[PDB]
Amino acid sequence: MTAAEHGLHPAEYPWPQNGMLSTFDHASLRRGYQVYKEVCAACHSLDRIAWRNLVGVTHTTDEAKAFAEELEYDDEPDDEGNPRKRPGKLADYIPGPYPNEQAARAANQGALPPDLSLIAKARHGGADYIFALLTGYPDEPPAGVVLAPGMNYNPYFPGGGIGMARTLFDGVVEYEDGTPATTSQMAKDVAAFLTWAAEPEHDERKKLGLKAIIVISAMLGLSVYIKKFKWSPIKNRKFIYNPP
């Protein structure tokens, strides 16, 4: 295949979470949530994440309850069996921008923006792909490239023509922690946040891994000592033969 058909391979960026003993940076996760909420959420859902998931990761119990309570969700029917709405709770899932695929495609010139809950695992490259894609729209497509209608040139996307336009521009978000919201900063934060969304066990998993590695290594060392101890009478055996 052509390199174009594959898409350019993203650089390997030094993420905080790269590293056997490294967690996510939770401050970057919080900022990335804010980019999702103010930019991506116009077109993309995050359907696998509930409000309770943010608590003790990016937000306190109260902040997350406040986000939930601002929305209306379908309740059980009332006593005459008529539909009702209720305010959101921590158990509720973050609601998407569109009621269905048809509405989503109609708003996006035919293209369907994917749900982003698993996107970091569903693409080769993970966080690096998301960062590269968001920051890799050239001002002008390479001479000779003919874009289909409603397509934008992005070399990281296979084939080069993507239905999503560039969305991150310096200062589209005002971070609540005072961080300068450059294109690069927002792409890094949102890529970190989406990586967390795809793998929220990440931090715990790696710490349990460290414990496992240590115990298992020690047990491997001791099993070698014990095997050699038990085998030494066999290994040390000597013979004297006197032909009958």
């Binding site: 921590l90 158990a91 349990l208 115990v215 020690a218 001791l222 014990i226 040390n236 000597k238 004297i240």
Partner: protein, 63 residues
């Protein structure tokens, strides 16, 4: 070579203090440590693994 009463040479392997309590104790320390880590590793494994059967996060959210 011929006499079977002349024991082959085991001097490269023999410990001088082979009959001492210290000698035995050391090997039982290794066996004991290994049993200890195996017990701790089994307990961790069993606890973490069986916890799958306790109410999951979505069940606890609706409680």
């Amino acid at each position: 070579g011929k006499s079977t009463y002349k024991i082959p040479d085991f001097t490269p392997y023999l410990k001088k203090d082979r009959n001492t309590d210290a000698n035995r104790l050391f090997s039982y320390f290794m066996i004991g440590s290994f049993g200890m880590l195996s017990a701790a590793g089994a307990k961790a494994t069993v606890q973490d693994f069986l916890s799958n059967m306790s109410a999951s996060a979505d069940v606890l959210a609706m409680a």
